Paper text:
In response, one family of large bacteriophages uses a nucleus-like compartment to protect its replicating genomes by excluding host defence factors. Here we find that the bacteriophage nuclear shell assembles primarily from one protein, which we name chimallin (ChmA). Combining cryo-electron tomography of nuclear shells in bacteriophage-infected cells and cryo-electron microscopy of a minimal chimallin compartment in vitro, we show that chimallin self-assembles as a flexible sheet into closed micrometre-scale compartments. We find that the shell is primarily composed of a single protein, chimallin, which self-assembles through its extended N and C termini into a closed compartment.
Author numbering:
A (entry chain D), B (entry chain G): 584 to 586, 591 to 615, 626 to 631
C (entry chain B): 47 to 95
D (entry chain A): 96 to 583
E (entry chain B): 145 to 193
F (entry chain H): 242 to 290
The structure:
Amino acid sequence: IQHAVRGNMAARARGLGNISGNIYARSDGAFNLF
Amino acid sequence: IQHAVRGNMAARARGLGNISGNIYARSDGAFNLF
Amino acid sequence: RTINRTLSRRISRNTGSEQVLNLRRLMEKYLEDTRFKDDFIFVAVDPNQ
Amino acid sequence: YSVPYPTLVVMSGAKVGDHNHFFGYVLPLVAGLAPLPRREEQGPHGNILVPRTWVDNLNGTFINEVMAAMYAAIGGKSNGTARIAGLAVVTNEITAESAHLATTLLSAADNAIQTAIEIRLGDKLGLPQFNLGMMASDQPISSVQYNTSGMQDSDIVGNPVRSDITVTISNRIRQAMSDYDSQQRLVATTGYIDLTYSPQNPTFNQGPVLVNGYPVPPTVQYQPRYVMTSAYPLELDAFTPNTFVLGLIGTIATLNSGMAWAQSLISNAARGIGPHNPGALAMVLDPEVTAPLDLSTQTNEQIYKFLQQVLYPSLLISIDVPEEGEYSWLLRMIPAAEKIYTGKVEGEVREISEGYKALYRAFDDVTLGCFSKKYQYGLPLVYATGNRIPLGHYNHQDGHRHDIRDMDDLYMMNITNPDTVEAWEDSFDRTDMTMSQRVVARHEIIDRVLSGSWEQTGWAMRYDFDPLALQALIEAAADAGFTIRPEN
Amino acid sequence: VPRTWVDNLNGTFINEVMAAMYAAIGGKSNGTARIAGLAVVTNEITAES
Amino acid sequence: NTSGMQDSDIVGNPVRSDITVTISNRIRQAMSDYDSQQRLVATTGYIDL
């Protein structure tokens, strides 16, 4: 079977995308007529 | 931390896309020679 | 077929009509004055029988 | 009596044990009176003048007076008990040649009273109610009609109703030996298609928008919406909440059969330049374009491809609930289920309200108890948008009276300038505006467009359903042995 | 496949019409009966027709 | 209003009514809070140069 390349391939997989939202402080008649 | 916008953001999430297909009525020699 | 008898209401918006009674009456009324009163026979066929 | 208008009450009774129960239907007659003036209110900036109509005068004092008259009619408090079963305003004159209208009104009153008696005392009186088990030995079918030119549908009084889309649910019968074919028509539904501005924000470092797990082109910014305007029986004598559920199931099944709802826009595109032309979205797509496009010479697939660049591929289900009318007593159950929890103190688990219970019970009883197994008890069923919509009519250029609900987003895009479009959408969407402010903004725009030549008759509120609940309802209906075959 | 009113008029319908006609005249011994034509009326009949 | 039918006199002849002004009286019930109006007089005319 046949088939360098520049760049760092492991760096992409170690990125931190998003974190949990619990770490942030929370802020702070007709029908019934008959 | 720094950073109105027109439009209704809740309307997109309330769209009904697809439903179950069970609600619809169903329609209606050589090898063996030896 | 009998849903109306099961879940019934006292006053109904759809009552139907009597086309066979209306048409037969008109034909007999037309014929009653001529001389061909006895030449025709009218037969009513309805799904109830 | 201390009432604002002359009214007539139709009463009937039922006896359980040794007690009597009486129910009444109220009919105010307002033809020939001057219309109501505007009321001054208090706003964040100052004072505003807010429009009113006939229903705004029917407050608690009116109810107390009607109840007193009813009690005097039957003999006294010791002769029974009285309750109000419905209300409707009659805006057209009644003469000595109006027998048909009187008969129709009497029929409506009788149906409302009988349904109230059933719901309140069925278990003790042994009165059944509709469910899907009665359609076990037959074949249900459905049909749809797209019509937008000419006369519209009418209500019990005689006023037009917008009916762009009409769906009919029937039952198919075949004679065993004689091989005759026939059908029996049960219920019908009307409505139309609207648009809601809803841009997608990619710049907030969020994931792409996915519809049915699929991404959409970056130019898509409008969400289609279906609005139900009416529902009524055809050959059924009785119309109850369970029958309404059957109509809802049929409409949802038909409208999703192969994107059948987009056929409305495609059919409208065939007339060319006009107030309902979908080609106005070409100005949204490309800013330089300043004139709506004519699509009457394109094939259907070309128009479908054009629409796929600007619209989300899903549908929102909404409904208009009138504050008074022929079937307002039936349809008031939808607003009642919007508040899930009474805040009452709970020993362990929070108490659940009664309107939510009634709607959940109807959904579960129509499907013979499968909805309970499919959907969790306590999840949302209905959301409130907060918009108060006017009802009325105006004179069309073809010689007929048309529903005032013809003024929507597409009408503004085709007829007016972009500033008016922005103002209309803003009154529909902004969350920092009170109800009266939105009412004032919409009233001003309509009055400017029509030169003041229109008449208002009532009010309505708009609600929408939860898509998860609807999917569970369709699945539960399938699990109870019910199938439907669209024919058109 | 679409259908219309005439598609329901099969042999069973003819047999029933013949039986009604024979009952009208008295019996088989009172004569013989035959069908001479057929037409469907699709418009309403009132007292002013 | 300037398109369509115009106002009429006692005999039945048209009168030019480009502008119409109505004077009324506003009433509110003290305890029951009902709203109504009572219309008194009207005037018609137009604008020339």
